RNA sequence: UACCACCCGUGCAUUUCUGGAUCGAUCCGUACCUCAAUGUCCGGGCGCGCGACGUUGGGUUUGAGGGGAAAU
């Protein structure tokens, strides 16, 4: 028997192993994968495609604005219009007018007609208002996205408005609505007349958004109607600085905050009301809920940060109890009503067109950076105005002396800042840093200064583990921000990009030091408030209306300067993007089957077999496989299907784009396949994996469901030393992304397999079930997991052709971090399935993990384990493919007495150790 | 069993058919994205210029993962 580490739980084996995992699932649902086919073109044919009416066309349909489906929907709705399944469209509503948000406006206007609305819950309501506005299975847009478009296009309004017999009042309303449709272009691209077709993706988005706005309005209803009035933070916690470092406000600052909250709480009951159609300004009402919500989010935040600091105080007082009892002096209650409501997104599409953005975005960089360089000699002259200088050495002793209640310490914190901007920096520029400091020789061992700025390991200040030892004569003689500003002045000069950031980063970096020399004073309104058009958080802006700032919230509004420049800053950097339309219709997929042109010698061991294949084999007398599919097609009827799967085939996608012309047969779901035709289309690339699921398609094993056509187009950026950035674009690329059904083709309760997750790789413990005895213990280690610790750096720089325009952040982290998820649940399944055997995971991940390793094993925990997060729960479906619930036959939990619920994770060398210890757990739990 | 040896990073490359039918054999299927490995570059750290000291350590899979689009 193979032994774990040759045992092969991969690939199609594997997709088969979770397969018949679900199969023997209690509940489960039927899910779809969408498989990418890379389309095959020639340079000369991906030349000749033209992205122009394929743009116009996403435009259209993804647009939010002027001359899209959402405008003319929207203005449908408020025109006083009511959408019927099966002219699909009556004017029966009000005309509701002057509604800047049309998507805030439609969920007014549908909420107003359901009634009793303030028992229904977030789901019902979003139910109840997207049969309302899209009319169940998007009914209504078949006639309203092709023949309805064109009447009202092509309709005059008093003709319209005797149809719908529409009173003269409403004929603003009409007008606006008839604009709209005449403002949207004519499809061209996928040969459709109309926008009929790609209407399922219109309904999904706008359900979508329907149903969060609903579930974030009834959250709301329940915020306000548990607001209990008079609590109030104990002015003992307030006190205590310890539990504030690190809310980001004063403790009079959250007792405003709160009294805020209850005003706003009036105001918030009064928006909702106003947004559930009750009346009065949609506009107003919206910006009041917003405020609120960010006022609820800000304060619940603050109280979550005091209660984790609170948590780490009480861990620290262990044996004292004078700590303790301090504790409960300041103990703090989080009430029920305080609850985050967070940012909504709001209907959003389109293609960004990269030459304006980037012109804009060049514009608004030095923009920003020029006003930055001019807020901070403001500053300084202000408090030179007065007379007393900055000097970040002096206040940084300054703030030591309070903290006790150094001249040394205070250049060690200088160069601590410095050195983990350095740390944040390329390789080259922490060469660079590196060989500067040598030379300077302020490090006791140059070997320290190496470690901590490459290695990213170390400190040279520690704040009341050892700081590294100094040169104190020659730390006292070396300024720091000189050396810095040289640094950057050095990486400006190379020229490279990554060089380039790494410069401006230091220069970040050394304003945000002179700025904390600023000494303690009051400092008027002017310097503080950012002219940058920046958003700014509740708090802050609480701060800033406030006549008098503090030396803090002057460094914040500097904080915020820096925060505009640095999105600029990933923006300009950017070598590659792709702008990406996809396009979905309602039809169904048709491949196309092509035989190859060759001679195939059949096996004669399939002439003597008694399946399809070999009733096939048995009939064809041809020689070219074309000819012998049609001989097969005459003859034996039934058994074309598994000849046409082991026959010379290519498949082919006709795009609608031109291609190669080819003789080849339809294969669509349903329909049994066509007579040869001469089809035009592009070939379809991918693996033998890819292909078998296709062939399986044409036995009945597998079912395609509707194509999405993605085109991208590539992009090219460089920015020149001046900074503007001049973009090029690549030859376009076609995909065909096909979701498809796989039937899938007829153990986990045996024994059961508990699972640590420990730093360096996972340890294993199988137990037999029906005896809860160990059978075998073991551990495995992950080289991925260990490796994406490692490669920070490089995931970050790597350039993504594929990464999106829109995209205001780097993700190459977050696309490593689900790489590394697949691998550490690969090693699980595999464990499972080498030994038969059901997971148990630790119920919680453990908090002293490092961040992103903590995160991975989240992902990994709600992949198996079962948690109540909708997110979580949907994870773990799609991944066992459909299964969301198995019963266990022979294990009660014990606390309920109720058969074991698996899914099918059960929640419960050191790896190993903790891996027996939490098998024991989940034993004692059933008992 | 054999195999291979300080620990990493950074940049640049190269490679990876990994799915089926039928009775090991014959024939279909052409190979996408990502990571990884490997090679190389330059740069750290550690032990005593170098790098495991018969005995150790490490890995072993048909390298691994792929559910999109939207977003964040």
Same mark, same amino acid.
């Given at each position: 028997?193979?032994?774990?580490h040759?045992?092969?739980?991969?690939?199609?084996?594997?997709?088969?192993?979770?397969?018949?995992?679900?199969?023997?699932?209690?509940?489960?649902?039927?899910?779809?994968?969408?498989?990418?086919?890379?389309?095959?073109?020639?340079?000369?044919?991906?030349?000749?495609?033209?992205?122009?009416?394929?743009?116009?066309?996403?435009?259209?349909?993804?647009?939010?604005?002027?001359?899209?489906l959402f405008?003319?929907?929207?203005?449908?709705?408020?025109?006083?219009?009511?959408?019927?399944?099966?002219?699909?469209?009556?004017?029966?509503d009000?005309?509701?007018?002057?509604?800047?948000?049309?998507?805030?406006?439609?969920?007014?206007?549908?909420?107003?007609?359901?009634?009793?609305?303030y028992?229904?819950?977030?789901?019902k309501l979003?139910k109840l =208002?997207?049969e309302?506005?899209?009319?169940?299975?998007?009914?209504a847009?078949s006639?309203?996205?092709?023949?309805?478009?064109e009447?009202?296009?092509?309709?005059?309004?008093?003709?319209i408005?005797?149809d719908?017999?529409?009173?003269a009042?409403?004929?603003?309303?009409?007008?606006?609505?008839?604009?709209?449709?005449?403002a949207?272009?004519?499809?061209?691209?996928?040969?459709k007349?109309?926008?009929?077709?790609?209407?399922?993706?219109?309904?999904?988005?706008?359900?979508?958004?329907?149903?969060?706005?609903?579930?974030?309005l009834?959250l709301?209803?329940?915020?306000?109607?548990?607001?209990?009035?008079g609590?109030?933070?104990?002015?003992a916690?307030?006190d205590?600085?310890?539990?504030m470092?690190?809310?980001?406000?004063?403790?009079?600052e959250?007792?405003?905050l709160?009294?805020?909250?209850?005003?706003?709480?009036?105001?918030?009951?009064?928006?909702?009301?106003?947004?559930?159609?009750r009346?009065?300004?949609?506009?107003?009402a919206?910006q009041?809920?917003?405020?609120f919500?960010?006022?609820?989010?800000?304060?619940?935040?603050?109280?979550?940060?005091?209660?984790?600091?609170?948590?780490?105080?009480?861990?620290?007082?262990?044996?004292?109890?004078?700590?303790?009892?301090?504790?409960?002096?300041?103990?703090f209650?989080?009430?029920?009503?305080?609850?985050?409501?967070?940012?909504?997104?709001?209907?959003?599409?389109?293609?960004?067109?990269?030459?304006?953005?980037?012109?804009?975005?060049?514009?608004?960089?030095?923009?920003?950076?020029?006003r930055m360089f001019?807020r901070?000699?403001?500053?300084?002259a202000?408090?030179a105005?007065k007379?007393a200088?900055?000097?970040?050495?002096?206040?940084l002793?300054?703030?030591?002396?309070?903290?006790?209640?150094?001249?040394?310490?205070?250049?060690?914190?200088?160069?601590?800042?410095?050195?983990?901007a350095?740390?944040?920096?390329?390789?080259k520029?922490?060469?660079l840093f590196?060989?500067k400091? =040598?030379?300077?020789?302020?490090?006791?061992?140059?070997?320290?200064?190496?470690?901590?700025?490459?290695?990213?390991?170390?400190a040279?200040?520690?704040?009341?583990?050892?700081?590294?030892?100094?040169?104190?004569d020659?730390?006292l003689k070396?300024?720091?921000l000189?050396?810095?500003?040289?640094?950057?002045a050095?990486?400006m000069?190379?020229?490279?990009?990554?060089?380039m950031?790494?410069?401006?980063?230091?220069?970040?970096?050394?304003?945000?030091?002179?700025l904390?020399?600023?000494?303690?004073?009051?400092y008027?309104?002017?310097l503080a408030?950012?002219?940058?058009?920046?958003?700014?958080?509740?708090?802050?802006?609480?701060?800033?209306?406030?006549?008098?700032?503090?030396?803090?919230?002057?460094?914040?509004?500097?904080?915020?300067?820096?925060?505009?420049?640095?999105?600029?800053?990933?923006?300009?950097?950017?070598?590659?993007?792709?702008?990406?339309?996809?396009?979905?219709?309602?039809?169904?997929?048709?491949?196309?089957?092509?035989?190859?042109?060759?001679?195939?010698?059949?096996?004669?061991?399939?002439?003597?077999?008694?399946?399809?294949?070999?009733?096939?084999?048995?009939?064809?007398?041809?020689?070219?496989?074309?000819?012998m599919?049609?001989?097969?097609?005459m003859?034996?009827?039934?058994?074309?299907?598994?000849?046409?799967?082991?026959?010379?085939?290519?498949?082919?996608?006709?795009?609608?784009?031109?291609?190669?012309?080819?003789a080849?047969?339809?294969?669509?779901?349903?329909?049994?396949?066509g007579?040869?035709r001469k089809?035009?289309?592009?070939?379809?690339?991918?693996?033998?994996?890819?292909?078998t699921?296709?062939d399986?398609?044409?036995?009945?094993?597998?079912?395609?469901?509707q194509?999405?056509?993605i085109?991208?187009?590539?992009?090219?950026?460089?920015?020149?030393?001046?900074?503007?950035?001049q973009?090029?674009?690549?030859?376009?690329?076609?995909?065909i992304?096909?979701?498809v059904?796989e039937?899938?083709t007829?153990?986990?309760?045996?024994?059961?397999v508990?699972?640590?997750?420990?730093?360096?790789?996972?340890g294993?413990?199988?137990?037999?079930?029906?005896?809860?005895?160990?059978?075998?213990?073991?551990?495995?280690?992950?080289?991925?997991?260990?490796?994406?610790?490692?490669?920070?750096?490089?995931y970050?720089?790597?350039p993504?052709?594929?990464?999106?325009?829109?995209?205001?952040?780097?993700?190459?982290?977050?696309?490593?971090?689900?790489?590394?998820?697949?691998?550490?649940?690969?090693?699980?399944?595999?464990?499972?399935?080498?030994?038969?055997?059901?997971?148990?995971?630790?119920?919680?991940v453990p908090?002293?993990?490092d961040?992103?390793?903590?995160?991975?094993?989240?992902?990994?925990?709600?992949?198996?384990?079962?948690?109540?997060?909708?997110?979580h729960?949907?994870?773990?479906?799609?991944?066992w493919?459909?299964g969301?619930?198995?019963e266990?036959?022979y294990?009660?939990?014990?606390?309920?007495?109720?058969?074991?619920?698996?899914?099918?994770?059960r929640?419960?060398?050191?790896?190993?150790?903790?891996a027996?210890?939490?098998?024991?757990?989940?034993?004692?739990?059933?008992?």
């Amino acid at each position: 028997s193979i032994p774990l580490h040759a045992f092969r739980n991969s690939g199609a084996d594997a997709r088969k192993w979770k397969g018949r995992i679900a199969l023997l699932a209690k509940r489960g649902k039927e899910t779809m994968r969408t498989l990418q086919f890379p389309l095959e073109m020639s340079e000369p044919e991906a030349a000749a495609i033209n992205t122009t009416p394929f743009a116009v066309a996403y435009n259209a349909i993804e647009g939010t604005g002027k001359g899209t489906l959402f405008d003319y929907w929207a203005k449908l709705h408020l025109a006083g219009f009511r959408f019927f399944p099966s002219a699909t469209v009556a004017w029966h509503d009000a005309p509701m007018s002057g509604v800047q948000n049309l998507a805030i406006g439609v969920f007014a206007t549908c909420a107003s007609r359901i009634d009793n609305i303030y028992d229904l819950n977030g789901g019902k309501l979003s139910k109840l =208002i997207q049969e309302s506005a899209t009319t169940p299975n998007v009914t209504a847009l078949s006639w309203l996205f092709g023949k309805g478009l064109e009447y009202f296009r092509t309709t005059d309004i008093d003709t319209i408005m005797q149809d719908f017999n529409i009173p003269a009042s409403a004929k603003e309303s009409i007008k606006p609505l008839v604009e709209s449709a005449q403002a949207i272009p004519t499809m061209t691209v996928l040969g459709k007349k109309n926008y009929a077709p790609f209407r399922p993706n219109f309904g999904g988005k706008i359900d979508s958004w329907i149903a969060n706005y609903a579930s974030r309005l009834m959250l709301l209803n329940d915020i306000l109607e548990q607001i209990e009035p008079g609590f109030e933070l104990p002015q003992a916690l307030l006190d205590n600085e310890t539990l504030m470092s690190g809310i980001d406000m004063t403790g009079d600052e959250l007792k405003e905050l709160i009294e805020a909250v209850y005003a706003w709480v009036d105001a918030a009951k009064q928006g909702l009301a106003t947004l559930l159609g009750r009346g009065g300004n949609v506009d107003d009402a919206v910006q009041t809920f917003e405020q609120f919500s960010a006022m609820m989010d800000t304060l619940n935040g603050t109280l979550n940060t005091i209660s984790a600091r609170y948590v780490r105080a009480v861990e620290m007082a262990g044996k004292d109890e004078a700590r303790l009892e301090k504790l409960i002096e300041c103990k703090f209650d989080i009430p029920k009503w305080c609850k985050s409501v967070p940012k909504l997104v709001g209907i959003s599409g389109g293609l960004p067109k990269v030459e304006e953005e980037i012109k804009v975005m060049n514009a608004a960089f030095k923009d920003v950076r020029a006003r930055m360089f001019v807020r901070f000699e403001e500053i300084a002259a202000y408090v030179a105005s007065k007379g007393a200088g900055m000097d970040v050495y002096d206040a940084l002793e300054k703030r030591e002396l309070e903290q006790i209640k150094a001249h040394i310490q205070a250049y060690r914190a200088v160069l601590h800042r410095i050195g983990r901007a350095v740390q944040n920096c390329s390789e080259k520029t922490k060469q660079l840093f590196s060989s500067k400091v =040598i030379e300077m020789g302020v490090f006791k061992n140059p070997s320290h200064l190496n470690n901590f700025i490459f290695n990213q390991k170390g400190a040279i200040y520690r704040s009341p583990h050892a700081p590294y030892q100094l040169h104190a004569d020659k730390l006292l003689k070396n300024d720091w921000l000189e050396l810095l500003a040289e640094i950057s002045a050095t990486l400006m000069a190379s020229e490279s990009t990554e060089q380039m950031e790494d410069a401006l980063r230091l220069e970040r970096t050394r304003l945000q030091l002179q700025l904390s020399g600023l000494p303690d004073w009051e400092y008027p309104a002017s310097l503080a408030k950012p002219d940058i058009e920046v958003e700014i958080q509740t708090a802050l802006k609480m701060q800033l209306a406030k006549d008098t700032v503090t030396s803090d919230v002057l460094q914040r509004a500097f904080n915020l300067y820096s925060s505009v420049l640095s999105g600029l800053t990933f923006k300009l950097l950017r070598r590659s993007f792709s702008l990406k339309m996809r396009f979905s219709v309602a039809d169904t997929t048709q491949l196309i089957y092509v035989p190859k042109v060759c001679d195939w010698a059949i096996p004669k061991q399939y002439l003597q077999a008694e399946g399809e294949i070999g009733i096939a084999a048995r009939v064809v007398t041809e020689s070219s496989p074309a000819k012998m599919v049609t001989e097969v097609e005459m003859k034996e009827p039934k058994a074309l299907g598994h000849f046409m799967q082991q026959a010379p085939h290519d498949w082919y996608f006709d795009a609608s784009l031109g291609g190669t012309q080819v003789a080849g047969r339809i294969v669509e779901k349903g329909k049994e396949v066509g007579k040869e035709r001469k089809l035009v289309g592009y070939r379809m690339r991918g693996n033998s994996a890819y292909k078998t699921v296709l062939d399986k398609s044409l036995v009945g094993n597998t079912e395609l469901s509707q194509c999405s056509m993605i085109i991208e187009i590539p992009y090219t950026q460089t920015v020149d030393a001046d900074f503007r950035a001049q973009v090029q674009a690549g030859l376009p690329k076609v995909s065909i992304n096909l979701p498809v059904k796989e039937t899938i083709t007829a153990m986990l309760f045996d024994r059961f397999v508990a699972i640590d997750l420990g730093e360096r790789g996972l340890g294993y413990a199988v137990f037999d079930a029906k005896t809860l005895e160990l059978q075998e213990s073991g551990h495995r280690p992950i080289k991925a997991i260990t490796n994406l610790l490692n490669r920070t750096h490089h995931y970050e720089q790597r350039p993504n052709q594929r990464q999106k325009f829109q995209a205001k952040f780097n993700v190459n982290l977050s696309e490593l971090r689900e790489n590394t998820v697949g691998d550490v649940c690969h090693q699980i399944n595999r464990i499972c399935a080498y030994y038969n055997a059901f997971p148990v995971l630790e119920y919680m991940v453990p908090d002293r993990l490092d961040k992103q390793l903590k995160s991975v094993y989240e992902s990994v925990t709600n992949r198996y384990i079962w948690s109540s997060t909708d997110a979580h729960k949907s994870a773990r479906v799609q991944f066992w493919l459909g299964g969301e619930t198995w019963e266990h036959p022979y294990l009660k939990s014990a606390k309920d007495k109720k058969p074991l619920v698996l899914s099918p994770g059960r929640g419960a060398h050191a790896d190993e150790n903790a891996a027996v210890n939490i098998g024991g757990k989940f034993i004692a739990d059933i008992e």
